[PDB]
PDB file of C-alpha atoms (C1' of nucleotides) in Angstrom:
ATOM      1  CA  UNK A 401      38.238  33.357 193.978  1.00 24.92           C
ATOM      2  CA  UNK A 402      35.140  35.212 192.768  1.00 27.43           C
ATOM      3  CA  UNK A 403      33.661  38.627 193.555  1.00 28.07           C
ATOM      4  CA  UNK A 404      30.240  37.926 195.072  1.00 28.29           C
ATOM      5  CA  UNK A 405      28.285  40.969 196.244  1.00 23.12           C
ATOM      6  CA  UNK A 406      25.559  41.533 198.816  1.00 21.65           C
ATOM      7  CA  UNK A 407      21.947  40.613 198.063  1.00 26.28           C
ATOM      8  CA  UNK A 408      18.535  41.020 199.696  1.00 23.34           C
ATOM      9  CA  UNK A 409      18.842  39.868 203.294  1.00 23.71           C
ATOM     10  CA  UNK A 410      22.646  40.218 203.271  1.00 27.27           C
ATOM     11  CA  UNK A 411      24.972  43.131 204.019  1.00 27.37           C
ATOM     12  CA  UNK A 412      28.483  43.878 205.305  1.00 25.95           C
ATOM     13  CA  UNK A 413      29.692  44.462 208.858  1.00 26.38           C
ATOM     14  CA  UNK A 414      32.822  45.174 210.902  1.00 31.09           C
ATOM     15  CA  UNK A 415      33.718  42.924 213.838  1.00 31.02           C
ATOM     16  CA  UNK A 416      33.899  44.996 217.032  1.00 31.90           C
ATOM     17  CA  UNK A 417      34.165  42.592 219.972  1.00 31.99           C
ATOM     18  CA  UNK A 418      35.425  39.054 219.386  1.00 32.64           C
ATOM     19  CA  UNK A 419      33.700  36.790 221.925  1.00 34.10           C
ATOM     20  CA  UNK A 420      33.476  33.064 222.614  1.00 33.82           C
ATOM     21  CA  UNK A 421      30.802  30.335 222.431  1.00 35.59           C
ATOM     22  CA  UNK A 422      30.874  30.560 218.618  1.00 32.92           C
ATOM     23  CA  UNK A 423      29.438  34.065 218.308  1.00 33.36           C
ATOM     24  CA  UNK A 424      30.676  37.625 217.920  1.00 34.68           C
ATOM     25  CA  UNK A 425      29.500  41.232 217.819  1.00 35.40           C
ATOM     26  CA  UNK A 426      29.552  42.997 214.453  1.00 36.26           C
ATOM     27  CA  UNK A 427      28.556  46.557 213.563  1.00 37.01           C
ATOM     28  CA  UNK A 428      26.428  46.527 210.417  1.00 37.75           C
ATOM     29  CA  UNK A 429      26.559  49.290 207.804  1.00 37.67           C
ATOM     30  CA  UNK A 430      23.006  50.444 208.622  1.00 38.67           C
ATOM     31  CA  UNK A 431      23.691  51.812 212.117  1.00 38.15           C
ATOM     32  CA  UNK A 432      22.589  49.078 214.526  1.00 35.07           C
ATOM     33  CA  UNK A 433      24.374  46.609 216.795  1.00 35.27           C
ATOM     34  CA  UNK A 434      23.653  42.913 216.295  1.00 35.18           C
ATOM     35  CA  UNK A 435      24.718  39.623 217.890  1.00 34.59           C
ATOM     36  CA  UNK A 436      26.000  37.588 214.953  1.00 35.34           C
ATOM     37  CA  UNK A 437      26.411  33.808 214.881  1.00 37.01           C
ATOM     38  CA  UNK A 438      29.323  31.741 213.574  1.00 37.62           C
ATOM     39  CA  UNK A 439      28.316  29.526 210.642  1.00 35.66           C
ATOM     40  CA  UNK A 440      28.876  25.765 210.689  1.00 34.72           C
ATOM     41  CA  UNK A 441      31.671  26.046 208.134  1.00 34.29           C
ATOM     42  CA  UNK A 442      33.046  29.157 209.865  1.00 32.92           C
ATOM     43  CA  UNK A 443      34.076  27.605 213.191  1.00 35.24           C
ATOM     44  CA  UNK A 444      37.361  25.917 212.219  1.00 36.22           C
ATOM     45  CA  UNK A 445      37.797  26.070 208.422  1.00 37.33           C
ATOM     46  CA  UNK A 446      38.315  29.853 208.590  1.00 36.87           C
ATOM     47  CA  UNK A 447      39.199  32.131 211.501  1.00 36.54           C
ATOM     48  CA  UNK A 448      37.336  35.417 211.999  1.00 33.26           C
ATOM     49  CA  UNK A 449      39.309  38.327 213.446  1.00 35.65           C
ATOM     50  CA  UNK A 450      38.547  41.898 214.525  1.00 36.72           C
ATOM     51  CA  UNK A 451      37.855  44.882 212.215  1.00 34.11           C
ATOM     52  CA  UNK A 452      37.388  42.733 209.117  1.00 36.09           C
ATOM     53  CA  UNK A 453      34.944  42.793 206.195  1.00 32.85           C
ATOM     54  CA  UNK A 454      32.393  39.983 206.544  1.00 31.96           C
ATOM     55  CA  UNK A 455      29.048  39.017 205.025  1.00 27.51           C
ATOM     56  CA  UNK A 456      26.144  39.188 207.480  1.00 26.14           C
ATOM     57  CA  UNK A 457      22.657  37.778 206.915  1.00 25.60           C
ATOM     58  CA  UNK A 458      19.471  39.578 207.929  1.00 23.01           C
ATOM     59  CA  UNK A 459      16.703  38.130 210.076  1.00 20.98           C
ATOM     60  CA  UNK A 460      13.130  38.719 208.961  1.00 19.66           C
ATOM     61  CA  UNK A 461      11.183  38.573 212.240  1.00 17.79           C
ATOM     62  CA  UNK A 462      13.658  39.666 214.934  1.00 17.51           C
ATOM     63  CA  UNK A 463      16.102  42.549 214.557  1.00 18.24           C
ATOM     64  CA  UNK A 464      18.809  41.790 217.137  1.00 15.41           C
ATOM     65  CA  UNK A 465      20.348  38.551 215.797  1.00 17.47           C
ATOM     66  CA  UNK A 466      22.360  37.800 212.659  1.00 19.61           C
ATOM     67  CA  UNK A 467      24.738  35.216 211.176  1.00 19.93           C
ATOM     68  CA  UNK A 468      28.033  35.452 209.288  1.00 18.09           C
ATOM     69  CA  UNK A 469      28.634  33.948 205.836  1.00 19.18           C
ATOM     70  CA  UNK A 470      31.946  35.008 204.268  1.00 16.39           C
ATOM     71  CA  UNK A 471      35.162  36.952 204.865  1.00 17.97           C
ATOM     72  CA  UNK A 472      37.103  39.311 202.588  1.00 18.31           C
ATOM     73  CA  UNK A 473      40.793  39.489 203.376  1.00 19.62           C
ATOM     74  CA  UNK A 474      42.566  42.405 201.670  1.00 16.94           C
ATOM     75  CA  UNK A 475      42.282  42.924 197.938  1.00 14.60           C
ATOM     76  CA  UNK A 476      38.703  41.880 197.204  1.00 12.94           C
ATOM     77  CA  UNK A 477      37.704  43.955 200.250  1.00 13.14           C
ATOM     78  CA  UNK A 478      39.441  47.075 198.930  1.00 15.77           C
ATOM     79  CA  UNK A 479      38.045  46.378 195.446  1.00 17.83           C
ATOM     80  CA  UNK A 480      34.551  46.173 196.952  1.00 15.17           C
ATOM     81  CA  UNK A 481      35.212  49.445 198.806  1.00 12.10           C
ATOM     82  CA  UNK A 482      36.352  51.034 195.526  1.00  9.64           C
ATOM     83  CA  UNK A 483      32.977  50.075 194.019  1.00 10.63           C
ATOM     84  CA  UNK A 484      31.074  51.844 196.814  1.00 10.19           C
ATOM     85  CA  UNK A 485      28.874  50.118 199.395  1.00 11.20           C
ATOM     86  CA  UNK A 486      29.444  51.844 202.767  1.00  9.10           C
ATOM     87  CA  UNK A 487      29.438  55.324 204.309  1.00  7.81           C
ATOM     88  CA  UNK A 488      32.901  56.856 204.068  1.00  3.89           C
ATOM     89  CA  UNK A 489      33.178  57.479 207.829  1.00  3.24           C
ATOM     90  CA  UNK A 490      34.079  53.819 208.446  1.00  5.85           C
ATOM     91  CA  UNK A 491      37.775  52.945 208.267  1.00  6.81           C
ATOM     92  CA  UNK A 492      39.432  49.840 206.831  1.00  5.96           C
ATOM     93  CA  UNK A 493      42.555  50.407 209.014  1.00  6.12           C
ATOM     94  CA  UNK A 494      44.539  48.138 206.627  1.00  5.93           C
ATOM     95  CA  UNK A 495      42.976  44.748 207.362  1.00  6.83           C
ATOM     96  CA  UNK A 496      45.230  41.938 206.096  1.00  8.50           C
ATOM     97  CA  UNK A 497      47.453  39.165 207.395  1.00  5.08           C
ATOM     98  CA  UNK A 498      50.453  40.383 209.377  1.00  2.47           C
ATOM     99  CA  UNK A 499      54.040  39.191 209.019  1.00  3.46           C
TER     100      UNK A 499
ATOM    101  C1'   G B 705     -57.231  41.929 272.051  1.00  5.43           C
ATOM    102  C1'   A B 706     -53.281  45.405 268.039  1.00  5.04           C
ATOM    103  C1'   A B 707     -49.206  48.996 267.902  1.00  6.66           C
ATOM    104  C1'   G B 708     -45.402  50.073 271.479  1.00  2.88           C
ATOM    105  C1'   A B 709     -41.695  49.769 276.012  1.00  3.95           C
ATOM    106  C1'   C B 710     -38.146  47.726 280.205  1.00  4.66           C
ATOM    107  C1'   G B 711     -35.296  43.083 281.076  1.00  4.80           C
ATOM    108  C1'   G B 712     -33.109  38.177 279.439  1.00  6.49           C
ATOM    109  C1'   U B 713     -31.326  34.622 275.429  1.00 11.82           C
ATOM    110  C1'   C B 714     -29.709  33.087 270.337  1.00  9.75           C
ATOM    111  C1'   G B 715     -27.189  36.205 267.270  1.00  9.80           C
ATOM    112  C1'   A B 716     -25.741  38.284 261.409  1.00  9.54           C
ATOM    113  C1'   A B 717     -22.784  42.636 261.204  1.00 10.79           C
ATOM    114  C1'   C B 718     -20.062  47.261 262.094  1.00 12.32           C
ATOM    115  C1'   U B 719     -15.663  50.518 264.042  1.00 11.72           C
ATOM    116  C1'   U B 720     -10.963  50.946 266.552  1.00 12.53           C
ATOM    117  C1'   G B 721      -6.010  47.145 266.958  1.00 11.39           C
ATOM    118  C1'   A B 722      -2.747  42.848 266.810  1.00 13.72           C
ATOM    119  C1'   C B 723      -1.588  38.060 264.689  1.00 18.44           C
ATOM    120  C1'   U B 724      -1.914  35.649 260.049  1.00 21.70           C
ATOM    121  C1'   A B 725      -1.636  31.326 254.558  1.00 21.25           C
ATOM    122  C1'   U B 726      -0.832  32.351 249.176  1.00 17.41           C
ATOM    123  C1'   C B 727       0.269  35.503 244.903  1.00 17.78           C
ATOM    124  C1'   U B 728       2.176  39.852 242.323  1.00 18.73           C
ATOM    125  C1'   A B 729       6.673  44.764 241.813  1.00 19.32           C
ATOM    126  C1'   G B 730      11.133  45.986 244.112  1.00 17.28           C
ATOM    127  C1'   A B 731      17.383  49.834 243.473  1.00 18.81           C
ATOM    128  C1'   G B 732      21.255  46.835 245.808  1.00 17.59           C
ATOM    129  C1'   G B 733      24.213  41.653 245.114  1.00 20.65           C
ATOM    130  C1'   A B 734      25.806  36.740 245.615  1.00 23.21           C
ATOM    131  C1'   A B 735      24.831  32.057 243.253  1.00 23.28           C
ATOM    132  C1'   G B 736      23.678  27.668 239.647  1.00 22.64           C
ATOM    133  C1'   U B 737      22.907  25.888 234.563  1.00 23.62           C
ATOM    134  C1'   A B 738      23.343  25.630 228.522  1.00 24.12           C
ATOM    135  C1'   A B 739      26.164  27.825 224.489  1.00 22.60           C
ATOM    136  C1'   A B 740      32.694  25.236 218.455  1.00 22.77           C
ATOM    137  C1'   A B 741      36.648  29.081 219.134  1.00 21.51           C
ATOM    138  C1'   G B 742      37.927  35.746 224.647  1.00 22.77           C
ATOM    139  C1'   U B 743      42.178  36.686 228.806  1.00 21.17           C
ATOM    140  C1'   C B 744      45.628  34.905 232.626  1.00 21.90           C
ATOM    141  C1'   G B 745      48.119  30.662 234.535  1.00 21.52           C
ATOM    142  C1'   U B 746      48.733  25.162 234.588  1.00 21.01           C
ATOM    143  C1'   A B 747      45.816  22.795 240.078  1.00 23.54           C
ATOM    144  C1'   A B 748      44.584  17.185 238.862  1.00 22.96           C
ATOM    145  C1'   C B 749      45.235  12.185 235.507  1.00 22.41           C
ATOM    146  C1'   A B 750      52.207   8.426 234.244  1.00 21.94           C
ATOM    147  C1'   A B 751      56.594   9.496 240.815  1.00 22.90           C
ATOM    148  C1'   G B 752      51.710  15.070 236.275  1.00 21.48           C
ATOM    149  C1'   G B 753      57.337  16.812 237.284  1.00 21.21           C
ATOM    150  C1'   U B 754      56.499  19.627 245.323  1.00 22.42           C
ATOM    151  C1'   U B 755      52.896  11.766 245.541  1.00 24.47           C
ATOM    152  C1'   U B 756      47.445  12.383 246.130  1.00 23.75           C
ATOM    153  C1'   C B 757      43.136  12.568 249.748  1.00 21.79           C
ATOM    154  C1'   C B 758      40.551  13.753 254.631  1.00 22.73           C
ATOM    155  C1'   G B 759      39.614  17.082 259.442  1.00 22.15           C
ATOM    156  C1'   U B 760      41.062  22.062 261.098  1.00 18.89           C
ATOM    157  C1'   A B 761      43.331  27.074 260.814  1.00 20.94           C
ATOM    158  C1'   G B 762      45.786  31.060 258.425  1.00 21.99           C
ATOM    159  C1'   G B 763      47.201  32.950 253.751  1.00 23.54           C
ATOM    160  C1'   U B 764      47.049  34.884 248.440  1.00 27.43           C
ATOM    161  C1'   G B 765      44.517  37.730 241.048  1.00 27.95           C
ATOM    162  C1'   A B 766      42.867  32.630 239.862  1.00 31.12           C
ATOM    163  C1'   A B 767      43.292  27.375 239.947  1.00 31.10           C
ATOM    164  C1'   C B 768      45.925  27.409 244.594  1.00 31.26           C
ATOM    165  C1'   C B 769      50.057  27.003 249.268  1.00 28.45           C
ATOM    166  C1'   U B 770      51.623  26.213 254.258  1.00 28.48           C
ATOM    167  C1'   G B 771      51.320  24.386 259.705  1.00 29.60           C
ATOM    168  C1'   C B 772      49.353  20.105 262.770  1.00 27.89           C
ATOM    169  C1'   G B 773      47.139  14.998 263.026  1.00 27.58           C
ATOM    170  C1'   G B 774      45.597  10.800 260.151  1.00 25.51           C
ATOM    171  C1'   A B 775      44.560   7.323 255.171  1.00 24.96           C
ATOM    172  C1'   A B 776      46.598   4.012 251.199  1.00 21.13           C
ATOM    173  C1'   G B 777      42.024   4.766 247.305  1.00 19.76           C
ATOM    174  C1'   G B 778      50.891   4.662 247.103  1.00 16.09           C
ATOM    175  C1'   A B 779      55.518   4.314 243.428  1.00 15.88           C
ATOM    176  C1'   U B 780      56.570  -0.233 249.306  1.00 18.01           C
ATOM    177  C1'   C B 781      52.534  -6.771 250.858  1.00 17.19           C
ATOM    178  C1'   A B 782      59.963  -8.160 252.011  1.00 17.84           C
ATOM    179  C1'   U B 783      65.606  -6.084 253.463  1.00 17.41           C
ATOM    180  C1'   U B 784      68.542 -10.278 256.303  1.00 18.73           C
ATOM    181  C1'   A B 785      73.059 -11.005 263.428  1.00 15.72           C
TER     182        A B 785
END
RNA sequence: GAAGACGGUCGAACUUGACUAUCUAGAGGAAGUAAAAGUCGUAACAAGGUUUCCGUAGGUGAACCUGCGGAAGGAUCAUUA
């Protein structure tokens, strides 16, 4: 509904391996692998898929854990990409809902 | 009557070896437990769709199946001269 951007302690990541036990692996836009955690509103109200644009929170004393906040589906994700936040090597690969 | 010496006894300890109680690393690999969403299939609970279970043996990705002998914790307390 609204375009909210990243802040201090938050960034964007791409889901690489979709696991169980309410956690997943996401590749952050800084160049490090992290074990993210599914938020309490993100278990069943929304469904997180692979290769999607998500909001990932930083951890200030350990640097191998994270947690996920939001999810951008198609148009706000491509509008955020048009603004410029990521290295251009990463590929969207047309992330949206299929038919 | 001192130092010293042979022999005997008690005897700490040393060197060559074995046994030995506990702790700390260890490639390799099989296990158990706690995690809201991974994959395959549906074994069990209603006759769960092949009734379940026990002992033994073989089989197969996985739950699992089959042969032999028992149990009712069975869906039968009973089927007529």
